[PDB]
Write a protein that binds this DNA or RNA. Sequence first.
RNA 1: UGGCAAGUCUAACCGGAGUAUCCGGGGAGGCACAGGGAAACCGACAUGGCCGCAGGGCUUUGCCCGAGGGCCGCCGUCUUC
RNA 2: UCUCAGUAUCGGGAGGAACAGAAAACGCAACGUGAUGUCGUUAGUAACCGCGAGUGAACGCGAUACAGCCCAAACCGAAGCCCUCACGGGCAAUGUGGUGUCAGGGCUACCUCUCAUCAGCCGACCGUCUUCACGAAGUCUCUUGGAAUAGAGCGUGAUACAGGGUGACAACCCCGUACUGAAGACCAGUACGCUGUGCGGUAGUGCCAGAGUAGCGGGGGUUGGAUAUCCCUCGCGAAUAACGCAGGCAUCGACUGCGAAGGCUAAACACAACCUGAGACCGAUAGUGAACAAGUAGUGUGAACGAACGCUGCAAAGUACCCUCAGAAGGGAGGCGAAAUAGAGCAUGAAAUCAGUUGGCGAUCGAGCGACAGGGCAUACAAGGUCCCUUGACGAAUGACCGA
RNA 3: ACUAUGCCAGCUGGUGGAUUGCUCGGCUCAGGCGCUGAUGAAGGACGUGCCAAGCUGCGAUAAGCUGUGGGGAGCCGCACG
Lengths: 149, 115, 246
Amino acid sequence: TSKKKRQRGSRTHGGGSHKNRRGAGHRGGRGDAGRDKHEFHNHEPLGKSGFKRPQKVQEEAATIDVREIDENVTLLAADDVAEVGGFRVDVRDVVEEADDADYVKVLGAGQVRHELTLIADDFSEGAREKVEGAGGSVELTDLGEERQA
Amino acid sequence: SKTNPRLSSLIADLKSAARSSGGAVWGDVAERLEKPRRTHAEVNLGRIERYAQEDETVVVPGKVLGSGVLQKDVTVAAVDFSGTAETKIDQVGEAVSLEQAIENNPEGSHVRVIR
Amino acid sequence: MQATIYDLDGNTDGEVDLPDVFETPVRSDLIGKAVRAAQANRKQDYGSDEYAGLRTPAESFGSGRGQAHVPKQDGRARRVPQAVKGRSAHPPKTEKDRSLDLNDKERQLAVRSALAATADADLVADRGHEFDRDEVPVVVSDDFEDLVKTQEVVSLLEALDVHADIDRADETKIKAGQGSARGRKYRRPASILFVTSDEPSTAARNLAGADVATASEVNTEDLAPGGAPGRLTVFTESALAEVAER
RNA sequence: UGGCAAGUCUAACCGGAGUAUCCGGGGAGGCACAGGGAAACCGACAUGGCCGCAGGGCUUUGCCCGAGGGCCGCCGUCUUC
RNA sequence: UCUCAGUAUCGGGAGGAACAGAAAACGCAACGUGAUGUCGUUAGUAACCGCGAGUGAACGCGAUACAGCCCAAACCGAAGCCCUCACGGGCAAUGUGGUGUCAGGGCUACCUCUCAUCAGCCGACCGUCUUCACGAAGUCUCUUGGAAUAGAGCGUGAUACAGGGUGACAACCCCGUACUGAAGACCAGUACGCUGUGCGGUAGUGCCAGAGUAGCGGGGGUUGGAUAUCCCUCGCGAAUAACGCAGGCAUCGACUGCGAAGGCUAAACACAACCUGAGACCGAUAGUGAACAAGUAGUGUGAACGAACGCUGCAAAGUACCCUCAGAAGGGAGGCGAAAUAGAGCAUGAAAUCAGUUGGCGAUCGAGCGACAGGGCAUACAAGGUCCCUUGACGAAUGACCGA
RNA sequence: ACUAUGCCAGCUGGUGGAUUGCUCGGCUCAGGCGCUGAUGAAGGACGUGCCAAGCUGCGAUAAGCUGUGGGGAGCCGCACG
Ligand SMILES: [Cl-]
Ligand SMILES: [Cl-]
Ligand SMILES: [Cl-]
Ligand SMILES: [Cl-]
Ligand SMILES: [K+]
Ligand SMILES: [K+]
Ligand SMILES: [Mg+2]
Ligand SMILES: [Mg+2]
Ligand SMILES: [Mg+2]
Ligand SMILES: [Mg+2]
Ligand SMILES: [Mg+2]
Ligand SMILES: [Mg+2]
Ligand SMILES: [Mg+2]
Ligand SMILES: [Mg+2]
Ligand SMILES: [Mg+2]
Ligand SMILES: [Mg+2]
Ligand SMILES: [Mg+2]
Ligand SMILES: [Mg+2]
Ligand SMILES: [Mg+2]
Ligand SMILES: [Mg+2]
Ligand code: NA
Ligand code: NA
Ligand code: NA
Ligand code: NA
Ligand code: NA
Ligand code: NA
Ligand code: NA
Ligand code: NA
Ligand code: NA
Ligand code: NA
Ligand code: NA
Ligand code: NA
Ligand code: NA
Ligand code: NA
Ligand code: NA
Ligand code: NA
């Protein structure tokens, strides 16, 4: 039995005095009315903040952390380039929605437990260090090298 | 409350085993399963890998999922496993149903609860 | 397990592997859900005329006549829901969404689960089907598809000990209530589902309570009318195999 | 409450058919998978330490392991001589 | 201001659909897309806004359906068109007609082709909608009943067990239903087919290519359009392809896209008059205002407003004859029918309430009308069967008399 | 044993038209289809029947005239005289 199903006989359906449940006065005015006066609590404060750049000059990076690559090397071995006790993977082939992005960037969250040779457009400093410290290497794509200028 | 007749059967069997063979784990798991689905365990492999030891059966009052890597050779008992989880676990170890766990071990000895 | 194939004389001729899906754990909750959804999804939108009771310039006199303030036209109350001829306050509405969504996986699971329930003779008898045999579902030679006359199917079913279900379904209930005014006067028990491969069986279709279906499109309602699992079914050998991958 | 799970769901629509049901396609796109910053731009703990409930262990009235939880530490970014 | 809202309402007008439509586009900036509409998404994103409340796209993508063309001018210059059977008339140098239309074209000189386009002729299948023809098998026995379409028994058809009718639950009594077949309408003067025409390439040539326009300013409206929407109004005002416009502030250069100020265009989408089908819709105070004479009766000078009313019975067998009466009334008697308490606004026939009557109370007595307990009087059966008294057993809390 | 005017509850018969059952009407969805008019439409007025007030049909050829096809032993609209 629902709450609603139990209202018949109650007369006020949980509304308290029958003088409640009238128009918008019972809610302090329609929609966000009062957000600066009687109802100000827990509204964001009024005002204007910052600026936006045009949607068409914004670049979108496709990102992946080394952890995701590394946790998956064996399954990607069934697909991408095992060589050298080592693995070579072109990151553009791994990342979902790569083509829909301006560039592919490898980030540094988690561990690298294998020797990896990584090809991407960009690398965090931490992703470079982890992949090297694991005895691997980082290969900047041509587009990646263009980004240097 | 519960609509899945198999979940109910599982729960009823977990209680019967706890009341007879004295396994308190099974009672503990029964009570958690009786709690709302929202509170049920969902555990990835990285968590099992971290806290499990061999010849101690991992018991998940919930479902095991497939993120992460499991090297350790362990028996994992759960309400259910994702397809990927069961596949990754069966390589290095054994994935098993709670109904089998109760059969092999009604006293619930040498188990570690993981969520 | 193994299924015993039967020929058009009703005699065992060979046998086949009962496909793995017939081992699907039976979920009556999931099956009920798939059936409720299919049943909802064929219901038609309806609602009262949006202007019913509103076509009137009836006005209230307000105070001073010793009368309640109620809109009147020519001395009769109008428009308000407490008035005779007034509008319906919260009527049925066409814009209401009367459909039920169902996840493909969840629906597909219920199909497999209902399939499996047809392999369990106790379940099938529980559902209420009348028949005498240990083995269910009934599997049959693909030549069943070449049958034409309904009576041929009768003889075959009699030979398979399964015809008593048709007898169960041969009676109609004249339903209590006003559905008869809408063309819903009658109903009858569901008897035998016939699953073929190439096209559904015109020979079997008019048997009392029978349904006909095909392995590729057979659904949860077919396997579990009213969401009750374990329908007495006959599969054609090819159907039995085709259903395996559903 | 139920399905599936590092994923998940398809929308319009297409084909089939028992033709509004239903079966098969369709992942366009949405949310989730990493955040911080107005922006430029940069980009994180698959666990270092302690306490300890449930549970488990042991030679048991006490030791041990202790998921979850709790307290730290550390890491990304903004502001920052 | 904003919002309600470019809504209500008003003026004008088309069609079976309308409008839009072959880039002076887009601008995931590209080595990319390629007429238009619509649907899904992009997204409550960008943008607007007493920066309050609110408002609110687009490109792209996935789909649906797909289709691309004609002038003006250059160069030709009467080679042309309309009416009429014909004669004949009219139009037309202020240009009819040929060419031509960014795949730029024309001209000159070549190379090559009969393909594109355009004008014509023929002219459907299938599908869909509706209508129609044909269409299997019991009207057997007993019982009940006014009537079997009920019960029991014995049979039958089914590519037909949808629905309806018939004196009561009907696959087999009748219409129909499955199957098969026929017609009309729409698709469509469409697709296919065909006739005619002829596509295209190179070099040369500043021959042609839409002006109050592009653009700027003043004042307004509108929009998400923000210095970057679309439009109106007043004023000003270019260039000529070696030129011009756009790419969300202005100017200059570069780069990329594109060619305004002439025109046409199938299909996919909207509605529901009309045909048909359907329903977890309502079921006569409901559902339309309207199951009935329904926009009827009736109200208002008018604009306009606007109800209520469904059911005898299987069959009218719808009550002959007689008595009464002022009587074609009504009554009595009688007749029909299973039933007339089915007798005409006639199935059923609640409550409020009225007549008569039964039980209880009652003309000396007090008012939330009762609840609970207990008396009296009243009560056919059924559907409830208990209850009284003496004695005895058990016997919680509580708990004596008398007597000493 | 009497008691009227009355009170309460039934019974018989009314009044009334609820209830139940019934559906020739609605409501809504869907598929198809879709223009008419100076060759005078749509709409309206008035006619038109043996007897004809209403509705329907029709138009001084007036519930109808003609042709072709269908249909069939009955018929003279709703409407049983
Ligand atoms: Cl920005
Ligand atoms: Cl986890
Ligand atoms: Cl270990
Ligand atoms: Cl594009
Ligand atoms: K599983
Ligand atoms: K047009
Ligand atoms: Mg409020
Ligand atoms: Mg995508
Ligand atoms: Mg409204
Ligand atoms: Mg109404
Ligand atoms: Mg009822
Ligand atoms: Mg304010
Ligand atoms: Mg607006
Ligand atoms: Mg755009
Ligand atoms: Mg020309
Ligand atoms: Mg405005
Ligand atoms: Mg009405
Ligand atoms: Mg007046
Ligand atoms: Mg009556
Ligand atoms: Mg007295
Ligand atoms: Na409340
Ligand atoms: Na109230
Ligand atoms: Na408010
Ligand atoms: Na304030
Ligand atoms: Na794209
Ligand atoms: Na009205
Ligand atoms: Na009053
Ligand atoms: Na709807
Ligand atoms: Na996707
Ligand atoms: Na404003
Ligand atoms: Na201006
Ligand atoms: Na542009
Ligand atoms: Na009525
Ligand atoms: Na009494
Ligand atoms: Na039409
Ligand atoms: Na008349």
